[PDB]
Amino acid sequence: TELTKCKVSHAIKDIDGYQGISLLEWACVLFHTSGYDTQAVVNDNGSTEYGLFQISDRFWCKSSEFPESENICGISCDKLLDDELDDDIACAKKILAIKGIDYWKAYKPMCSEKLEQWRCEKP
Amino acid sequence: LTACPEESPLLVGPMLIEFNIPVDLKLVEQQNPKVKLGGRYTPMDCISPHKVAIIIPFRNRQEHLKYWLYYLHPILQRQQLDYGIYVINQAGESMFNRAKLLNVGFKEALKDYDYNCFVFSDVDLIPMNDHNTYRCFSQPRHISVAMDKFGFSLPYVQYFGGVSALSKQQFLSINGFPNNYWGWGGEDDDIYNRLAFRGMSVSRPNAVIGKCRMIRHSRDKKNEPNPQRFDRIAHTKETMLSDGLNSLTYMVLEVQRYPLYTKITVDIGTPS
Numbered sequence: 585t586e587l588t589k590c591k592v593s594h595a596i597k598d599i600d601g602y603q604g605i606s607l608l609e610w611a612c613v614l615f616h617t618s619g620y621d622t623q624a625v626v627n628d629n630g631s632t633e634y635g636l637f638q639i640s641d642r643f644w645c646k647s648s649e650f651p652e653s654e655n656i657c658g659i660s661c662d663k664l665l666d667d668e669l670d671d672d673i674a675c676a677k678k679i680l681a682i683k684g685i686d687y688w689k690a691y692k693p694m695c696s697e698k699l700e701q702w703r704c705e706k707p
Numbered sequence: 708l709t710a711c712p713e714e715s716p717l718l719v720g721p722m723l724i725e726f727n728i729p730v731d732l733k734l735v736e737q738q739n740p741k742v743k744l745g746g747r748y749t750p751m752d753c754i755s756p757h758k759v760a761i762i763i764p765f766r767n768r769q770e771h772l773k774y775w776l777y778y779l780h781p782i783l784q785r786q787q788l789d790y791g792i793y794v795i796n797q798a799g800e801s802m803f804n805r806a807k808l809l810n811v812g813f814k815e816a817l818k819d820y821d822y823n824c825f826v827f828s829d830v831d832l833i834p835m836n837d838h839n840t841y842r843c844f845s846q847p848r849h850i851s852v853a854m855d856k857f858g859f860s861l862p863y864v865q866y867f868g869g870v871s872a873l874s875k876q877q878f879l880s881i882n883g884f885p886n887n888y889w890g891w892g893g894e895d896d897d898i899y900n901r902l903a904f905r906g907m908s909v910s911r912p913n914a915v916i917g918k919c920r921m922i923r924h925s926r927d928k929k930n931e932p933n934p935q936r937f938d939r940i941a942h943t944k945e946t947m948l949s950d951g952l953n954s955l956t957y958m959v960l961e962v963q964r965y966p967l968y969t970k971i972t973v974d975i976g977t978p979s
Protein backbone atom coordinates (compact mmCIF):
# COMPACT_ATOMS: atom_id res chain seq x y z
CA THR A 585 0.00 0.00 0.00
CA GLU A 586 1.27 3.45 -0.90
CA LEU A 587 0.94 5.57 2.25
CA THR A 588 1.10 9.34 2.71
CA LYS A 589 3.83 11.26 4.47
CA CYS A 590 1.44 11.74 7.37
CA LYS A 591 0.35 8.12 7.58
CA VAL A 592 4.00 7.14 7.84
CA SER A 593 4.90 9.89 10.32
CA HIS A 594 2.04 8.78 12.58
CA ALA A 595 2.97 5.08 12.48
CA ILE A 596 6.65 5.51 13.34
CA LYS A 597 6.50 7.57 16.52
CA ASP A 598 8.37 4.91 18.55
CA ILE A 599 11.33 5.53 16.29
CA ASP A 600 11.24 9.30 16.80
CA GLY A 601 14.54 10.52 18.20
CA TYR A 602 15.88 6.96 18.34
CA GLN A 603 19.62 7.03 17.65
CA GLY A 604 19.17 10.77 17.06
CA ILE A 605 17.00 10.45 13.94
CA SER A 606 13.89 12.63 13.94
CA LEU A 607 10.48 12.06 12.31
CA LEU A 608 11.18 14.66 9.63
CA GLU A 609 14.38 12.86 8.74
CA TRP A 610 12.54 9.51 8.55
CA ALA A 611 9.69 10.96 6.49
CA CYS A 612 12.40 12.13 4.10
CA VAL A 613 14.37 8.88 4.14
CA LEU A 614 11.33 6.65 3.65
CA PHE A 615 10.09 8.63 0.65
CA HIS A 616 13.33 8.13 -1.23
CA THR A 617 13.79 4.60 0.08
CA SER A 618 10.41 3.14 -0.83
CA GLY A 619 8.15 5.95 -2.00
CA TYR A 620 6.15 5.09 1.14
CA ASP A 621 5.09 1.75 -0.41
CA THR A 622 4.60 -0.91 2.24
CA GLN A 623 4.90 -3.54 -0.51
CA ALA A 624 8.02 -2.28 -2.29
CA VAL A 625 10.42 -5.09 -3.27
CA VAL A 626 13.75 -4.13 -4.80
CA ASN A 627 16.61 -6.43 -5.67
CA ASP A 628 20.09 -5.07 -5.06
CA ASN A 629 22.71 -7.57 -6.31
CA GLY A 630 22.05 -11.12 -5.22
CA SER A 631 19.85 -9.80 -2.44
CA THR A 632 16.43 -8.31 -1.90
CA GLU A 633 15.08 -5.37 0.11
CA TYR A 634 11.56 -5.38 1.54
CA GLY A 635 8.85 -2.91 2.52
CA LEU A 636 8.60 0.70 3.70
CA PHE A 637 12.13 0.57 5.20
CA GLN A 638 13.61 -1.69 2.47
CA ILE A 639 15.02 -4.14 4.98
CA SER A 640 17.39 -6.53 3.22
CA ASP A 641 17.38 -10.35 3.32
CA ARG A 642 21.20 -10.26 3.29
CA PHE A 643 21.42 -10.05 7.13
CA TRP A 644 18.16 -8.80 8.54
CA CYS A 645 15.09 -10.86 7.60
CA LYS A 646 14.74 -14.43 6.39
CA SER A 647 13.56 -14.98 2.81
CA SER A 648 12.97 -18.21 0.91
CA GLU A 649 15.64 -17.33 -1.65
CA PHE A 650 18.13 -17.09 1.21
CA PRO A 651 17.06 -19.25 4.22
CA GLU A 652 20.61 -19.39 5.64
CA SER A 653 20.58 -15.60 6.17
CA GLU A 654 21.58 -14.35 9.61
CA ASN A 655 17.98 -13.11 9.96
CA ILE A 656 19.19 -10.75 12.67
CA CYS A 657 15.70 -9.30 13.05
CA GLY A 658 14.23 -12.78 13.58
CA ILE A 659 11.40 -12.31 11.13
CA SER A 660 10.18 -13.59 7.78
CA CYS A 661 10.76 -10.91 5.14
CA ASP A 662 7.13 -11.40 4.02
CA LYS A 663 6.09 -9.84 7.33
CA LEU A 664 7.68 -6.63 6.03
CA LEU A 665 5.30 -6.49 3.06
CA ASP A 666 2.05 -5.73 4.90
CA ASP A 667 0.43 -2.65 6.44
CA GLU A 668 1.27 -3.58 10.03
CA LEU A 669 4.40 -1.54 10.72
CA ASP A 670 5.25 -2.58 14.30
CA ASP A 671 7.49 -5.44 13.19
CA ASP A 672 9.07 -3.34 10.40
CA ILE A 673 9.87 -0.62 12.98
CA ALA A 674 11.30 -3.10 15.51
CA CYS A 675 13.63 -4.51 12.84
CA ALA A 676 14.58 -1.00 11.71
CA LYS A 677 15.49 -0.17 15.30
CA LYS A 678 17.87 -3.13 15.37
CA ILE A 679 19.44 -1.91 12.14
CA LEU A 680 19.87 1.54 13.67
CA ALA A 681 21.34 0.20 16.93
CA ILE A 682 23.66 -2.22 15.16
CA LYS A 683 24.64 -0.61 11.84
CA GLY A 684 23.30 2.93 12.07
CA ILE A 685 21.36 5.33 9.85
CA ASP A 686 23.91 4.79 7.05
CA TYR A 687 22.09 1.57 6.21
CA TRP A 688 19.70 3.90 4.39
CA LYS A 689 21.73 5.29 1.50
CA ALA A 690 19.32 8.18 0.80
CA TYR A 691 19.76 9.80 4.21
CA LYS A 692 23.00 11.72 3.56
CA PRO A 693 22.36 13.00 0.01
CA MET A 694 18.62 13.61 0.19
CA CYS A 695 17.94 14.37 3.83
CA SER A 696 20.71 16.62 5.10
CA GLU A 697 18.88 19.92 4.43
CA LYS A 698 15.40 21.28 3.70
CA LEU A 699 13.98 19.12 6.48
CA GLU A 700 11.05 21.30 7.47
CA GLN A 701 9.08 20.35 4.33
CA TRP A 702 8.86 16.80 5.70
CA ARG A 703 6.81 17.78 8.74
CA CYS A 704 3.28 16.39 9.10
CA GLU A 705 0.83 18.92 10.64
CA LYS A 706 -2.13 16.55 10.55
CA PRO A 707 -3.00 15.56 14.17
CA LEU B 708 3.23 40.09 -38.77
CA THR B 709 4.50 40.74 -35.26
CA ALA B 710 5.60 39.03 -32.06
CA CYS B 711 3.08 36.74 -30.41
CA PRO B 712 1.45 38.18 -27.31
CA GLU B 713 3.12 37.35 -23.99
CA GLU B 714 0.07 35.24 -23.16
CA SER B 715 -1.76 33.30 -25.87
CA PRO B 716 -5.34 34.39 -26.50
CA LEU B 717 -6.11 30.75 -27.37
CA LEU B 718 -5.65 29.16 -23.91
CA VAL B 719 -8.69 27.31 -22.49
CA GLY B 720 -7.33 26.82 -18.98
CA PRO B 721 -8.15 23.45 -17.33
CA MET B 722 -8.77 20.36 -19.45
CA LEU B 723 -10.14 16.85 -18.99
CA ILE B 724 -7.43 14.24 -19.50
CA GLU B 725 -8.48 10.63 -20.01
CA PHE B 726 -6.78 7.47 -21.24
CA ASN B 727 -9.89 5.46 -22.13
CA ILE B 728 -10.94 6.16 -25.71
CA PRO B 729 -8.35 4.68 -28.15
CA VAL B 730 -6.20 6.97 -30.25
CA ASP B 731 -5.91 7.01 -34.03
CA LEU B 732 -2.78 8.89 -35.04
CA LYS B 733 -4.26 9.20 -38.53
CA LEU B 734 -7.19 10.87 -36.82
CA VAL B 735 -4.73 13.04 -34.86
CA GLU B 736 -2.83 14.12 -37.98
CA GLN B 737 -6.15 14.91 -39.62
CA GLN B 738 -7.05 17.17 -36.67
CA ASN B 739 -3.62 18.87 -36.77
CA PRO B 740 -3.09 19.70 -40.49
CA LYS B 741 -0.67 22.53 -39.62
CA VAL B 742 1.96 20.19 -38.11
CA LYS B 743 4.59 19.35 -40.76
CA LEU B 744 6.55 16.13 -41.37
CA GLY B 745 8.75 15.36 -38.39
CA GLY B 746 6.25 17.00 -36.05
CA ARG B 747 7.26 20.63 -36.73
CA TYR B 748 4.98 23.62 -36.08
CA THR B 749 5.58 27.33 -36.53
CA PRO B 750 2.82 29.89 -35.82
CA MET B 751 1.48 31.65 -38.91
CA ASP B 752 -0.36 34.35 -36.92
CA CYS B 753 2.66 35.91 -35.25
CA ILE B 754 6.35 35.38 -34.58
CA SER B 755 7.13 33.30 -31.50
CA PRO B 756 10.38 33.91 -29.65
CA HIS B 757 10.28 30.38 -28.18
CA LYS B 758 11.93 27.88 -30.58
CA VAL B 759 11.25 24.71 -28.60
CA ALA B 760 12.53 21.18 -29.16
CA ILE B 761 10.53 18.71 -27.05
CA ILE B 762 12.61 15.66 -26.15
CA ILE B 763 11.10 12.36 -25.02
CA PRO B 764 13.21 9.42 -23.76
CA PHE B 765 11.77 6.31 -25.27
CA ARG B 766 11.75 2.55 -25.50
CA ASN B 767 8.70 0.39 -26.09
CA ARG B 768 6.13 3.06 -25.17
CA GLN B 769 4.22 3.38 -28.42
CA GLU B 770 0.79 3.29 -26.76
CA HIS B 771 1.82 6.02 -24.32
CA LEU B 772 3.17 8.14 -27.20
CA LYS B 773 -0.15 8.08 -29.05
CA TYR B 774 -1.86 9.60 -26.03
CA TRP B 775 1.01 12.08 -25.57
CA LEU B 776 0.77 13.20 -29.17
CA TYR B 777 -3.02 13.18 -29.04
CA TYR B 778 -3.06 15.73 -26.20
CA LEU B 779 0.11 17.79 -26.68
CA HIS B 780 -0.01 18.92 -30.30
CA PRO B 781 -3.26 20.88 -29.73
CA ILE B 782 -1.96 22.37 -26.50
CA LEU B 783 1.39 23.37 -27.94
CA GLN B 784 -0.14 25.10 -30.96
CA ARG B 785 -2.50 26.96 -28.67
CA GLN B 786 0.62 28.05 -26.76
CA GLN B 787 1.93 29.59 -30.00
CA LEU B 788 5.32 27.86 -29.91
CA ASP B 789 7.71 27.25 -32.83
CA TYR B 790 8.27 23.64 -31.84
CA GLY B 791 9.52 20.21 -32.87
CA ILE B 792 8.86 16.77 -31.40
CA TYR B 793 11.69 14.27 -30.85
CA VAL B 794 11.35 10.70 -29.62
CA ILE B 795 14.84 9.39 -28.75
CA ASN B 796 14.50 5.60 -28.95
CA GLN B 797 17.04 3.39 -27.19
CA ALA B 798 18.16 0.46 -29.32
CA GLY B 799 18.96 -2.88 -27.77
CA GLU B 800 17.77 -4.42 -24.55
CA SER B 801 20.35 -3.19 -22.05
CA MET B 802 19.56 -1.01 -18.99
CA PHE B 803 17.47 2.03 -19.89
CA ASN B 804 19.26 5.38 -19.69
CA ARG B 805 16.76 8.28 -19.56
CA ALA B 806 19.21 11.17 -19.07
CA LYS B 807 21.63 9.97 -21.71
CA LEU B 808 18.78 9.75 -24.25
CA LEU B 809 17.85 13.34 -23.30
CA ASN B 810 21.41 14.55 -24.09
CA VAL B 811 21.16 12.79 -27.47
CA GLY B 812 17.89 14.61 -28.07
CA PHE B 813 19.56 17.95 -27.42
CA LYS B 814 22.44 17.19 -29.84
CA GLU B 815 20.21 15.79 -32.58
CA ALA B 816 17.50 18.46 -32.39
CA LEU B 817 20.15 21.13 -33.03
CA LYS B 818 20.90 19.53 -36.43
CA ASP B 819 17.41 20.41 -37.61
CA TYR B 820 16.89 23.90 -36.31
CA ASP B 821 18.18 26.83 -34.27
CA TYR B 822 16.36 25.78 -31.05
CA ASN B 823 16.81 28.02 -28.02
CA CYS B 824 14.68 26.01 -25.60
CA PHE B 825 14.44 22.32 -24.69
CA VAL B 826 11.57 20.61 -22.94
CA PHE B 827 12.45 17.16 -21.64
CA SER B 828 9.33 15.11 -21.03
CA ASP B 829 8.53 11.60 -19.96
CA VAL B 830 6.39 9.93 -22.68
CA ASP B 831 3.55 9.45 -20.19
CA LEU B 832 2.90 12.89 -18.68
CA ILE B 833 0.06 15.07 -19.87
CA PRO B 834 -0.50 18.61 -18.56
CA MET B 835 -4.03 19.37 -17.39
CA ASN B 836 -3.87 23.14 -17.93
CA ASP B 837 -2.60 24.91 -21.01
CA HIS B 838 -1.54 27.89 -18.91
CA ASN B 839 1.41 25.63 -17.95
CA THR B 840 3.51 26.75 -20.90
CA TYR B 841 5.96 24.32 -22.52
CA ARG B 842 8.68 26.89 -23.08
CA CYS B 843 11.74 28.22 -21.25
CA PHE B 844 12.03 30.95 -18.61
CA SER B 845 14.77 33.04 -16.97
CA GLN B 846 15.52 30.08 -14.68
CA PRO B 847 15.35 26.30 -15.22
CA ARG B 848 11.65 25.48 -15.34
CA HIS B 849 10.00 22.46 -13.65
CA ILE B 850 6.72 21.75 -15.45
CA SER B 851 5.11 18.59 -13.98
CA VAL B 852 4.70 19.98 -10.48
CA ALA B 853 1.41 18.43 -9.35
CA MET B 854 1.13 14.89 -10.71
CA ASP B 855 -1.99 12.82 -10.03
CA LYS B 856 0.47 9.98 -9.23
CA PHE B 857 1.82 11.91 -6.22
CA GLY B 858 -1.66 13.03 -5.29
CA PHE B 859 -1.36 16.34 -7.14
CA SER B 860 1.49 17.60 -5.00
CA LEU B 861 5.20 18.12 -5.53
CA PRO B 862 6.88 15.26 -3.61
CA TYR B 863 9.76 17.45 -2.34
CA VAL B 864 10.98 20.95 -3.15
CA GLN B 865 14.10 19.59 -4.84
CA TYR B 866 12.16 17.27 -7.21
CA PHE B 867 12.94 17.87 -10.90
CA GLY B 868 11.55 14.72 -12.54
CA GLY B 869 8.80 14.28 -15.09
CA VAL B 870 8.73 17.35 -17.36
CA SER B 871 11.23 20.17 -17.37
CA ALA B 872 12.40 22.97 -19.63
CA LEU B 873 15.89 24.46 -19.95
CA SER B 874 17.02 27.18 -22.37
CA LYS B 875 20.04 26.29 -24.51
CA GLN B 876 22.31 28.35 -22.19
CA GLN B 877 20.98 26.80 -18.98
CA PHE B 878 21.62 23.35 -20.45
CA LEU B 879 25.08 24.28 -21.73
CA SER B 880 25.93 25.86 -18.37
CA ILE B 881 25.57 22.51 -16.54
CA ASN B 882 27.42 20.46 -19.19
CA GLY B 883 24.01 18.97 -19.95
CA PHE B 884 22.71 15.90 -18.14
CA PRO B 885 24.62 12.87 -16.77
CA ASN B 886 25.32 9.85 -18.99
CA ASN B 887 26.29 7.50 -16.15
CA TYR B 888 22.88 6.86 -14.57
CA TRP B 889 21.75 3.41 -15.72
CA GLY B 890 18.38 2.09 -14.70
CA TRP B 891 15.68 3.85 -12.72
CA GLY B 892 16.03 6.88 -10.45
CA GLY B 893 18.39 9.60 -9.34
CA GLU B 894 19.18 11.28 -12.65
CA ASP B 895 16.65 14.03 -11.96
CA ASP B 896 18.23 14.71 -8.55
CA ASP B 897 21.68 14.84 -10.20
CA ILE B 898 20.33 17.42 -12.68
CA TYR B 899 18.80 19.38 -9.82
CA ASN B 900 22.22 19.46 -8.10
CA ARG B 901 23.91 20.74 -11.25
CA LEU B 902 21.51 23.64 -11.69
CA ALA B 903 22.08 24.66 -8.06
CA PHE B 904 25.90 24.36 -8.30
CA ARG B 905 25.73 26.68 -11.29
CA GLY B 906 23.75 29.13 -9.17
CA MET B 907 20.28 28.61 -10.66
CA SER B 908 16.96 28.17 -8.82
CA VAL B 909 13.96 26.25 -10.15
CA SER B 910 11.02 28.19 -11.58
CA ARG B 911 7.56 26.51 -11.35
CA PRO B 912 3.95 27.48 -12.01
CA ASN B 913 1.76 27.12 -8.90
CA ALA B 914 0.32 23.68 -8.13
CA VAL B 915 -3.11 24.36 -9.65
CA ILE B 916 -1.71 25.53 -13.03
CA GLY B 917 0.86 22.75 -12.87
CA LYS B 918 -1.54 19.77 -12.55
CA CYS B 919 -0.60 16.82 -14.78
CA ARG B 920 -1.78 13.27 -15.24
CA MET B 921 0.56 10.34 -15.63
CA ILE B 922 -0.71 7.29 -17.49
CA ARG B 923 -0.80 4.42 -14.98
CA HIS B 924 1.82 1.71 -15.63
CA SER B 925 4.04 -1.01 -14.15
CA ARG B 926 7.81 -0.84 -13.98
CA ASP B 927 9.84 -1.82 -17.06
CA LYS B 928 12.35 -4.64 -17.02
CA LYS B 929 15.79 -3.26 -17.86
CA ASN B 930 14.89 -0.11 -15.91
CA GLU B 931 15.02 -1.44 -12.34
CA PRO B 932 16.04 0.91 -9.49
CA ASN B 933 19.70 1.85 -9.90
CA PRO B 934 21.48 0.63 -6.69
CA GLN B 935 24.22 3.28 -7.08
CA ARG B 936 21.87 6.24 -7.48
CA PHE B 937 22.24 7.69 -3.99
CA ASP B 938 26.04 7.48 -4.00
CA ARG B 939 26.13 9.08 -7.45
CA ILE B 940 23.85 11.91 -6.34
CA ALA B 941 26.30 12.75 -3.54
CA HIS B 942 29.14 13.51 -5.98
CA THR B 943 27.43 15.49 -8.74
CA LYS B 944 29.65 18.50 -8.04
CA GLU B 945 32.73 16.61 -9.16
CA THR B 946 31.22 14.37 -11.86
CA MET B 947 29.16 16.96 -13.73
CA LEU B 948 32.46 18.39 -14.97
CA SER B 949 33.37 15.11 -16.69
CA ASP B 950 30.05 13.38 -17.42
CA GLY B 951 27.74 15.36 -19.66
CA LEU B 952 27.44 16.83 -23.12
CA ASN B 953 31.24 16.90 -23.22
CA SER B 954 31.56 13.12 -22.92
CA LEU B 955 28.43 12.06 -24.79
CA THR B 956 29.03 9.35 -27.37
CA TYR B 957 26.45 7.32 -29.23
CA MET B 958 25.55 5.88 -32.59
CA VAL B 959 22.50 6.80 -34.66
CA LEU B 960 20.92 3.69 -36.17
CA GLU B 961 17.85 5.27 -37.78
CA VAL B 962 16.09 8.62 -38.19
CA GLN B 963 12.33 8.43 -38.82
CA ARG B 964 10.29 11.40 -39.86
CA TYR B 965 6.59 10.82 -39.20
CA PRO B 966 4.05 13.54 -39.82
CA LEU B 967 3.61 13.99 -36.02
CA TYR B 968 7.18 13.44 -34.80
CA THR B 969 10.80 12.52 -35.40
CA LYS B 970 11.89 9.17 -33.98
CA ILE B 971 15.67 8.79 -33.59
CA THR B 972 16.87 5.28 -32.73
CA VAL B 973 20.23 5.21 -30.98
CA ASP B 974 22.74 2.78 -29.57
CA ILE B 975 23.96 4.41 -26.35
CA GLY B 976 26.19 1.70 -24.98
CA THR B 977 25.91 -0.25 -21.74
CA PRO B 978 26.62 0.24 -18.00
CA SER B 979 30.37 0.97 -18.05
Ligand SMILES: CC(=O)N[C@H]1[C@@H](OP(=O)(O)OP(=O)(O)OC[C@H]2O[C@@H](n3ccc(=O)[nH]c3=O)[C@H](O)[C@@H]2O)O[C@H](CO)[C@H](O)[C@@H]1O
Nearest residue numbers: 764765766768803829830831868869891892893895927930
Ligand atom coordinates in the same frame (compact mmCIF):
# COMPACT_ATOMS: atom_id res chain seq x y z
C1 LIG C 1 6.50 11.60 -13.69
C2 LIG C 1 7.62 10.97 -12.94
O1 LIG C 1 7.46 10.44 -11.82
N1 LIG C 1 8.76 11.03 -13.64
C3 LIG C 1 10.05 10.47 -13.17
C4 LIG C 1 9.87 9.01 -12.66
O2 LIG C 1 9.24 8.23 -13.72
P1 LIG C 1 8.68 6.88 -13.44
O3 LIG C 1 8.87 6.12 -12.05
O4 LIG C 1 7.27 6.94 -13.84
O5 LIG C 1 9.33 5.84 -14.39
P2 LIG C 1 9.01 5.50 -15.97
O6 LIG C 1 8.91 4.03 -16.03
O7 LIG C 1 7.82 6.23 -16.48
O8 LIG C 1 10.35 6.14 -16.57
C5 LIG C 1 10.42 7.49 -17.09
C6 LIG C 1 10.34 7.68 -18.58
O9 LIG C 1 11.32 6.89 -19.31
C7 LIG C 1 10.78 6.45 -20.54
N2 LIG C 1 10.94 4.93 -20.53
C8 LIG C 1 11.35 4.18 -19.40
C9 LIG C 1 11.49 2.85 -19.42
C10 LIG C 1 11.23 2.11 -20.64
O10 LIG C 1 11.33 0.91 -20.75
N3 LIG C 1 10.82 2.88 -21.74
C11 LIG C 1 10.66 4.27 -21.76
O11 LIG C 1 10.31 4.94 -22.72
C12 LIG C 1 9.41 7.03 -20.62
O12 LIG C 1 9.43 8.31 -21.26
C13 LIG C 1 9.07 7.10 -19.17
O13 LIG C 1 7.92 7.91 -18.87
O14 LIG C 1 11.17 8.52 -12.21
C14 LIG C 1 12.15 8.44 -13.34
C15 LIG C 1 13.27 7.92 -12.50
O15 LIG C 1 14.38 7.49 -13.22
C16 LIG C 1 12.31 9.85 -14.01
O16 LIG C 1 13.01 10.71 -13.17
C17 LIG C 1 10.94 10.41 -14.42
O17 LIG C 1 11.18 11.70 -15.02
Ligand SMILES: [Ca+2]
Nearest residue numbers: 663664668669
Ligand atom coordinates in the same frame (compact mmCIF):
# COMPACT_ATOMS: atom_id res chain seq x y z
CA1 LIG D 1 4.79 -5.64 8.89
Ligand SMILES: [Mn+2]
Nearest residue numbers: 829831921924
Ligand atom coordinates in the same frame (compact mmCIF):
# COMPACT_ATOMS: atom_id res chain seq x y z
MN1 LIG E 1 5.99 7.08 -15.70
